[PDB]
Amino acid sequence: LDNIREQLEEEAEGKADIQRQLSKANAEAQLWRTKYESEGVARAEELE
Amino acid sequence: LDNIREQLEEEAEGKADIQRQLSKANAEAQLWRTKYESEGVARAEELE
């Protein structure tokens, strides 16, 4: 019980970084897709 | 102490799924973004 008490903080720290890892990632990938393929293939569409 | 066994493992199942695999289905977005710039914009400078 004193042992898994330490493990609960470890999974919490295992939680905390990986929820914060996605919030940087899912912002950037989705944002890039929204803002770089609107310029990308569409200006490639019209310039052709 | 038996009750917090599932509070470990089901959250550990939650962290292994809802934090981990939902992150990796985001690696795909980043890959798509890289693919767009890398091939798309080299054309979009060349056709410019």
Identity (one letter) of the amino acid at A12? A
Q: What is the resolution of this structure in A?
A: 4.2
Round to whole Å and give the CA distance between A13 and A27: 22
Structure tokens at A35: 């803002």
At CA B38, angle to CA B35 and CA B43, rounded to 5?
Answer: 115
Experimental method: cryo-EM
Q: A3 and chain B: CB distance < 8 Å anywhere?
A: no
CB-based contacts of B22: which residues, under 8 Å, 6+ apart? A22
Dist CA A30 CA A44 (whole Å): 21
- The Cα-based distances of A27 to A24, A37, B29, B37, B40 in angstroms read 5, 15, 10, 18, 22
| Candidates A19, A22, A40; nearest CB to B26 | A22
Are the beta carbons of A29 and B29 closer than 8 angstroms?
yes
Cβ <8 Å between A14 and B15: yes
Contacts of B33 (CB under 8 A, 6+ apart): A29, A32, A33, A36
Q: Which two tokens stand for residue B37?
A: 């710039």
Query: Does any CB of chain B come closer than 8 Å to the CB of residue A38?
Result: no
Residue of A22, A33, A20 whose CA lies nearest to B22: A22
In the block, tokens 């919030």 appear at A23
